[PDB]
């Protein structure tokens, strides 16, 4: 794949249909599971471990679907969805490096939610710091993640793990 440092919302939507990295590359979820609007920076070096970095953003507005049901009369973006965005970015990066296969989240170490995303916020920022990448027969990524809302850190996740699989018959 020809690597770009950033991707637009249109690119992320093309990705969900497998039109970005080709038919062998991984796909990002499509709405309403897509949890980012754009990827503002992607590098092979950099990040807290100098092994890779990804920064993405999600624009917030009061009308996003999840505010209406989580919860009724007490809108707050589900934490699980910010967490999924992080898994999505780790998997996307693996595909960006040329990894082939279907994306499947494998797990995460500690996750801490210290703040919330309200319908009055404006922008959610995701930062992924890669600590390890296996791109041999097996394609797997390990990273730490940070979620900020309007420049303030609210969630951290250690050891997000995602792999790409050509055969998912054993799951």
- Residues near a copy of itself (CB under 8 A) are 16-18, 27-34, 65-66, 68-74, 76, 78-81, 83-84, 87, 102-116, 154, 168, 171
The Cα-based distances of 72 to 66, 69, 75, 118, 149 in angstroms read 10, 5, 7, 13, 22
The contacts of residue 34 (CB under 8 Å, 6+ apart) are 12, 13, 16, 28, 88
Under 8 Å between Cβ of 112 and 159? no
Under 8 Å between Cβ of 36 and 84? no
Collapse the DSSP code of 40 into the 3-class scheme (helix H, G, I; strand E, B; otherwise coil) and give the result.
strand
Closer to ligand DAC by Cβ: residue 97 or 105: 105
Residue numbers at the binding site for ligand DAC (CB under 6 A): 26, 28, 70, 76, 78-79, 84, 87-88, 91-92, 103-106, 113-116, 162, 171
**98 contact, one of a copy of itself, ligand DAC, none, CB 5-8 Å limit per kind:** none
Under 8 Å between Cβ of 57 and 66? no
**Distance of closest approach, residue 81 Cβ to ligand DAC, in angstroms:** 9
Collapse the DSSP code of 161 into the 3-class scheme (helix H, G, I; strand E, B; otherwise coil) and give the result.
strand
The catalytic position among 70, 102, 104, 131 is 70
**Distance of closest approach, residue 116 Cβ to a copy of itself, in angstroms:** 4
**Distance of closest approach, residue 129 Cβ to a copy of itself, in angstroms:** 19
**109 contact, one of ligand DAC, a copy of itself, none, CB 5-8 Å limit per kind:** a copy of itself
Residue 70 is a catalytic residue: yes
**111 contact, one of ligand DAC, a copy of itself, none, CB 5-8 Å limit per kind:** a copy of itself
Q: What are phi and psi of 135, to 5 degrees?
A: -125, 40
**Distance of closest approach, residue 166 Cβ to a copy of itself, in angstroms:** 12
**92 contact, one of a copy of itself, ligand DAC, none, CB 5-8 Å limit per kind:** ligand DAC
Q: Which of 154, 170, 3, 162 is nearest to 76 (CA)?
A: 154
């Amino acid at each position: 794949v020809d690597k770009r440092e950033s991707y637009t919302k249109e690119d992320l939507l093309a990705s969900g249909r497998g039109e970005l990295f080709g038919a062998k590359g991984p796909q990002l979820p499509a709405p309403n599971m897509l949890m980012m609007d754009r990827v503002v920076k992607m590098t092979e070096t950099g990040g807290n471990f100098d092994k890779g970095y990804v920064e993405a953003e999600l624009d917030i507005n009061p009308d996003l679907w999840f505010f209406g049901c989580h919860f009724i009369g007490d809108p707050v973006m589900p934490g699980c969805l910010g967490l999924d965005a992080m898994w999505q970015l780790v998997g996307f990066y693996l595909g960006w490096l040329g990894g082939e296969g279907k994306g499947r989240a494998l797990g995460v170490g500690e996750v801490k939610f210290t703040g919330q995303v309200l319908p009055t916020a404006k922008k959610v920022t995701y930062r992924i710091h890669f600590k390890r990448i296996v791109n041999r027969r097996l394609i797997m990524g390990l990273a730490d993640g940070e979620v900020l809302v309007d420049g303030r850190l609210i969630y951290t996740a250690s050891d997000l793990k995602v792999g790409l699989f050509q055969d998912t018959s054993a799951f």
